[PDB]
Design a protein around this ligand. Structure first.
Ligand SMILES: [Cl-]
Ligand SMILES: [Cl-]
Ligand SMILES: [Mg+2]
Ligand SMILES: [Mg+2]
Lengths: 7, 236, 236, 7
């Protein structure tokens, strides 16, 4: 549910 | 604009100083000035632009989430009425975040994207366009939410089409684009299976191309591949 | 001012929201608005004011030091000439830092200090006055440097006189004032022996008063005593 | 020489 990683 | 009197090279020089000082609002203003000189951006200058605004909007998004959570709790059952202040301040931060997003999208539309002919530049700017429509989508709740979502999707899709035809599977920009389009599917488009499928296929096709790379390129590509793995672990 | 239309209580409420969101520029603007309502500040409201501006000016000072170091290196022997940009941007950050300091000192002068009659409030504001003249002194290089230094010294000294007469040696405000006056001696006034003597005497006199305190007060006092110990270890 | 702690 937590925020996913992004670039 | 306030940067119209400053040389392009001085704006770039000061953008790098601001980054070293962790002054990212300054950094973004300098790079906005540089873009508005009207000349295309080099690879290094494109990354200065993205780093500056990523950090500015990153802080706004973190703040918006804190305030949104407080607001949601305030609207639960049994919660004391505390007046309009929570909503007002969430709206303040939200409006400033939307303003930053509009500024970036305006730079891309006037006129970075239309002058970008090389795959590396065009994909870079279209990824940015998808990213900042995604950030608008994260806070959208009205009648334009579906169009904002489709604007992010459309920009990501054009970037994906180009990157798959014009770049190797290990290209850091291609990898970061796919990472973020996957996040869009999961967090914005309510399509977790598409997000998981895209992250897996991207990781696997990059894995199979690592053997072509130098040690330095291998390090860049595997760093971004790990982010795909992190998300797949988070989501499965 | 832009906060003149907002209720005092709403400004305080939003200052606390901003702190939770780590939006310290917002927090400082809200608390400036609250001060300008003209009513005295409670203990909690005083600490909101100090936390907000401490964080804002703290980031500016960290940035100024990064840029000042780059500037100094650029003026060494063998260093390539790179133009006026480093100095210009250091001056930009410096001017913004000085503006924040002037704003705080203006709030203290109009009219927080003159209406503060209790020891806890008067010492708190005079410590702040000493702190923000110290921050001005950290960047001063001109003909007013000696007067800026003496303005910090004079404010710290009046606060010390009051706190020693009116507060116990373990009072967190008294301890933090002495900590900072000691730092002033070492980093501003070129008086390291005075800084070391003050930190030692402050620590020892607090140690001897801990037995009078509750567990909660003991925790507050020992936390600040550790900062005195840290500095004595750093300096000896 | 480093920056000292303050309150
Ligand atoms: Cl507000
Ligand atoms: Cl500048
Ligand atoms: Mg190619
Ligand atoms: Mg007393």
């Amino acid at each position: 549910k937590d925020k996913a990683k992004s670039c | 604009g306030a940067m119209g009197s400053m040389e392009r090279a001085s704006l770039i020089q000061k953008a790098k100083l601001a980054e070293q000082a962790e002054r990212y609002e300054d950094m973004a203003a300098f790079m906005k000035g540089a873009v508005e000189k009207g000349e295309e951006l080099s690879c290094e200058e494109r990354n200065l632009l993205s780093v500056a605004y990523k950090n500015v909007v990153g802080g706004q998004r973190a703040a918006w989430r804190v305030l949104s959570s407080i607001e949601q709790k305030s609207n639960e059952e049994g919660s004391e009425e505390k007046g309009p202040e929570v909503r007002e301040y969430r709206e303040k931060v939200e409006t400033e975040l939307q303003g930053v997003c509009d500024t970036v999208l305006g730079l891309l539309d006037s006129h970075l994207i239309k002058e970008a002919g090389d795959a590396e530049s065009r994909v870079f700017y279209l990824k940015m366009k998808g990213d900042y429509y995604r950030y608008l989508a994260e806070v959208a709740t009205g009648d334009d939410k579906k169009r904002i979502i489709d604007s992010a999707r459309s920009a990501y899709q054009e970037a994906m089409d180009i990157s798959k035809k014009e770049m190797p599977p290990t290209n850091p920009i291609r990898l970061g684009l796919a990472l973020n389009f996957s996040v869009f599917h999961y967090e914005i488009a309510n399509s977790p299976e598409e997000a998981i499928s895209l992250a897996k296929t991207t990781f696997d096709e990059a894995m199979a191309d690592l053997h072509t790379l130098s040690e330095d390129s291998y390090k860049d590509s595997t760093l971004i591949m790990q982010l795909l793995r992190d998300n797949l672990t988070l989501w499965t």
